[PDB]
Design a protein around this ligand. Structure first.
Ligand SMILES: [Mg+2]
Ligand SMILES: [Mg+2]
Ligand SMILES: [Mg+2]
Ligand SMILES: [Mg+2]
Ligand SMILES: [Mg+2]
Ligand SMILES: [Mg+2]
Ligand SMILES: [Mg+2]
Ligand SMILES: [Mg+2]
Ligand SMILES: [Mg+2]
Ligand SMILES: [Mg+2]
Ligand SMILES: [Mg+2]
Ligand SMILES: [Mg+2]
Ligand SMILES: [Mg+2]
Ligand SMILES: [Mg+2]
Ligand SMILES: [Mg+2]
Ligand SMILES: [Mg+2]
Ligand SMILES: [Mg+2]
Ligand SMILES: [Mg+2]
Ligand SMILES: [Mg+2]
Ligand SMILES: [Mg+2]
Ligand SMILES: [Mg+2]
Ligand SMILES: [Mg+2]
Ligand SMILES: [Mg+2]
Ligand SMILES: [Mg+2]
Ligand SMILES: [Mg+2]
Ligand SMILES: [Mg+2]
Ligand SMILES: [Mg+2]
Ligand SMILES: [Mg+2]
Lengths: 136, 94, 116, 58, 75
RNA sequence: GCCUGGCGGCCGUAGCGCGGUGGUCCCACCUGACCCCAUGCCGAACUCAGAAGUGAAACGCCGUAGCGCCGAUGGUAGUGUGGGGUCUCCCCAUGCGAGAGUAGGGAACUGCCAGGCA
RNA sequence: GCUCAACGGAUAAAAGGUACUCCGGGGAUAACAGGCUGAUACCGCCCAAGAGUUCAUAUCGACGGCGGUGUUUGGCACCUC
RNA sequence: CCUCCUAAAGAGUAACGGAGGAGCACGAAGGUUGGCUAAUCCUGGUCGGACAUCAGGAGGUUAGUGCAAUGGCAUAAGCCA
RNA sequence: GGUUCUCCCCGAAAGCUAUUUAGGUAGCGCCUCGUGAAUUCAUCUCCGGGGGUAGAGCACUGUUUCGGCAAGGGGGUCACUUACCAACCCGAUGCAAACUGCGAAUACCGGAGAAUGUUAUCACGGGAGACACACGGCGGGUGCUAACGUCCGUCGUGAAGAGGGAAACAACCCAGACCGCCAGCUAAGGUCCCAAAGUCAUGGUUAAGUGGGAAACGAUGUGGGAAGGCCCAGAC
């Protein structure tokens, strides 16, 4: 379950998630899974989609994950009042914008790849779309 | 084979460019040589279908504006972030 | 780095003479020759100069590049300076110590009536 | 000057303070108030600030 | 463990470009020489630039470092 | 007019790099060091007295786009005002409009004084 | 000459209990209930790894995903002191 | 009390918001003159280890600043007398 | 808690600092009255400025995936190798409130100039009130980008604002009520009846009362578009 090895600071501001993505083209494989929607991808979600990818394809090809959950999210536990300091880190998310390639794959045919990503996409909270490598 | 039938842009920038992509045309630009740059608007689906082929980004291409057949190469292409559309093409002369 | 070392060694005094708006009597020294210019506060125009690489004062010297050649250049540039009307200058050693050839040149210009 | 005609078309109630001072510099006091102003870039630029709420006859 | 802060120092530029200052007028309050002192500008102990002459504030980039300098041009 | 040196402007289209090139002069190394002065050891540096030697090093000039640097047009992003929506985000009208990048440029330019060959 | 550090420093000099309690007040501020919210909870669904002798989907449904209810624990402090 | 962020490119700007410091030190660690310029790695070298000291090279401040952090600092504000 | 006749003009604040202070008070801010005085003030245009935010980017600070070029450790041999590991560097891919080799729009300071505005400005003085704010938009912290939640900034409204609209609805949309009128034009919003005004015109869409509450996902619903494979060597 992906997570930064070390971070400069423990807790990050909520921030906002505006704009189109960077990492919009397939860069390492022949095929990829691209986000259409916007929203946070948690580390558990990324591992589950990856688990479903690597099983739809059995020791076949190579898989890349283009997103990293580097943003720490906090939660006050149950029955704590408001304030008294910021909560504790519970999970890690990657902020996702419309356009972001999330995973890439080669070494398999397209049709197996359309099926692998469809199963992975069911694990994610964001609309996605299949995409192919483009020349120039 | 690739013969793009283009028109010249009368107004430029963001409003004008968005107005085009809402009308199934997209902006583009021709540069290179010592001629000045030439801003063209293309029909989207026409160019969309042709750049699906592989020999669009490798062979010489020709763009007709005002009757004049201008030969070019595809140089850079701005794709939509999350759709199979086109925002902008850079054509270099050759 | 012997060249650059001197230029960096001269910067503070030089930059300080800019801000004080003072015409500075610059000195350049080589193992052979010695030089002197009276440079205006803009730093971009000479008023008066003298040097041992000439003939008007190099035939009168055993060897250009000694304390007595310096004195000649020092006494020379002050005389040229006092004709043009130039009396108050600031000495710029330009990263050479104020010890021998430079001190000779500067000590002579003092006697010849340059205020520093 | 060519003495252009500016009429106030909308209320100044909820508008920004800069907009309200633009109206004052044009002399516009109420909806329908037509003023006569010398046509200059300065005058043309005040109109552009509050163009949403003024119509101009030339 | 994270509830402390310092009072704010009100640093920065006090007189902008072309602004006619009297001698003594502070021009920049700064931590360090973010701006350096030029003609008729003094650099104080806290590195604040102040005018030595009455005149007009002039910002300029000069030198081989492209450092930012402030000077007073007498009007 | 060409070469050199000093002082500046300008502060990388000015820099690094690479290949070539120059010694009348100037500049550099260089020769020597009782005395001037000097090394927290060293005449290496600083420094003084010099002028056999060399342009090897350096420096300067010339060349070469490997690099750095500069850099459009166009589009993209953002945004002031107004308006609107499916309102955690967006769109419309208008105005402003990047950054990155692409084509492309690019082996600085210029002044004062001095000296030297012509 | 003051960790007058509760740092614009009440006095040189100061801890508690009150269910034996009392007054002034507050819905400016808790406890009950209502209200907003729905993290939690409950209920449902999407993907289906697999279990199910074979067989994903009779039955169950890992990793994860989306909602519904106002329904538990709570959050808030808008009503009522 | 100081520093950064929050803080929306002038200043200022809140939370039992996020992160760290101070309650000193110094007659030199101050003044001035003069001089010098780091870290790190590479190559080679007695005891030498992966790292002491020496020499060169690449590097160019990726160091250093009496103590936090920020902004500064080569004309050094950094090292030496 | 309550504080008793009338009309006319102006008209806040619920902020900062400090307080055994936090529902009190004081100075400042904001109100008013008076006096005095400079294009003093505001808007737009032009000019002069500084930025380091948005966005972007990844040289730096850190963080991240892949690939390439490869020292160095360590299971064993008892130096050879090693299915493990491997930094620096190179190429590619991203992320950042406390990263910036880039960098706006806006806002702010200043100057000039015109129109414009009942001096709108500043100063001194007389009198104050106020220092519980609220919702909405924008930008944010906090919380769950939960709360009619909480804390800042900024604007607007309510507070202290009636009228019309949003069924009803302080804070939203329109719009600022001196009085009177059985006159007229419009705003938002609306025009079949309750209920003032189109059962308006042209072209289409929908068949679900969708409209007139709700997501992932599901599906020969239906409209439109771009192409394209098979097709009278006979296809579905
Ligand atoms: Mg726009
Ligand atoms: Mg106290
Ligand atoms: Mg106190
Ligand atoms: Mg007290
Ligand atoms: Mg009892
Ligand atoms: Mg009682
Ligand atoms: Mg209450
Ligand atoms: Mg409250
Ligand atoms: Mg009740
Ligand atoms: Mg009660
Ligand atoms: Mg600020
Ligand atoms: Mg601001
Ligand atoms: Mg009034
Ligand atoms: Mg207070
Ligand atoms: Mg008063
Ligand atoms: Mg950003
Ligand atoms: Mg980086
Ligand atoms: Mg109070
Ligand atoms: Mg209060
Ligand atoms: Mg408030
Ligand atoms: Mg509230
Ligand atoms: Mg009240
Ligand atoms: Mg009503
Ligand atoms: Mg009517
Ligand atoms: Mg209507
Ligand atoms: Mg009717
Ligand atoms: Mg009809
Ligand atoms: Mg319905």
């Amino acid at each position: 379950m992906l997570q930064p090895k070390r971070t400069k600071f423990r807790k990050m501001h909520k921030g906002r998630n505006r704009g189109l993505a960077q990492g919009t083209d397939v860069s390492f494989g022949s095929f990829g899974l691209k986000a259409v929607g916007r929203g946070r991808l948690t580390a558990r979600q990324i591992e589950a989609a990856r688990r479903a990818m690597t099983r739809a394809v059995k020791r076949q090809g190579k898989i890349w994950i283009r997103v990293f959950p580097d943003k720490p999210i906090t939660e006050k536990p149950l029955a704590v009042r408001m304030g008294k300091g910021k909560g504790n880190v519970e999970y890690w998310v990657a902020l996702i914008q419309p356009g972001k390639v999330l995973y890439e794959m080669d070494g398999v045919p397209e049709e197996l790849a359309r099926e692998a990503f469809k199963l992975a996409a069911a694990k994610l909270p964001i609309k996605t779309t299949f995409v192919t490598k483009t020349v120039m | 084979m690739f013969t793009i039938n283009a028109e010249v842009r009368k107004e430029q920038g963001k409003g004008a460019s968005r107005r085009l992509r809402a009308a199934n045309k997209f902006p583009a630009i021709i540069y290179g040589g010592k001629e000045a740059p030439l801003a063209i608007e293309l029909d989207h689906d026409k160019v969309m279908n042709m750049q699906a082929k592989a020999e669009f980004y490798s062979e010489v291409l020709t763009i007709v504006v005002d009757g004049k057949e201008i030969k070019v190469k595809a140089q850079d292409v701005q794709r939509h972030p999350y759709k199979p559309k086109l925002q902008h093409i850079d054509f270099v002369r050759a | 780095d012997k060249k650059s070392a001197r230029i960096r060694r001269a910067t503070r005094a030089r930059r300080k003479l800019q801000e004080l708006g003072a015409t500075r009597l610059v000195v350049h020294r080589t193992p052979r020759h010695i030089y002197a210019q009276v440079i205006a506060p803009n730093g971009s125009e000479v008023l008066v100069a003298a040097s041992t690489v000439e003939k008007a004062i190099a035939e009168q010297l055993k060897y250009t590049g000694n304390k007595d050649a310096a004195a000649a250049v020092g006494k020379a540039v002050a005389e040229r300076a006092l004709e043009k009307g130039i009396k108050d200058v600031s000495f710029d050693r330009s990263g050479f110590q104020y010890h021998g050839r430079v001190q000779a040149l500067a000590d002579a210009a003092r006697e010849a009536g340059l205020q520093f | 000057a060519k003495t252009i005609k500016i009429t106030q078309t909308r209320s100044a109630i909820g508008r920004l303070p800069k907009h309200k001072a633009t109206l004052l510099g044009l002399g516009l006091r109420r909806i329908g108030h037509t003023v006569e102003r010398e046509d200059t870039p300065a005058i043309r630029g005040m109109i552009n600030a509050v163009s949403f709420m003024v119509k101009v006859e030339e | 463990r994270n509830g402390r802060d310092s009072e704010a120092k009100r640093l920065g530029v006090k007189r902008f470009g072309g602004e006619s200052v009297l001698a003594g007028s502070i021009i920049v309050r700064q931590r360090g020489t973010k701006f350096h002192a030029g003609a008729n500008v003094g650099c104080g102990r806290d590195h604040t630039l102040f005018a030595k002459a009455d005149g007009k504030v002039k910002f300029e980039v000069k030198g081989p470092k492209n450092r930012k300098f402030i000077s007073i041009e007498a009007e």
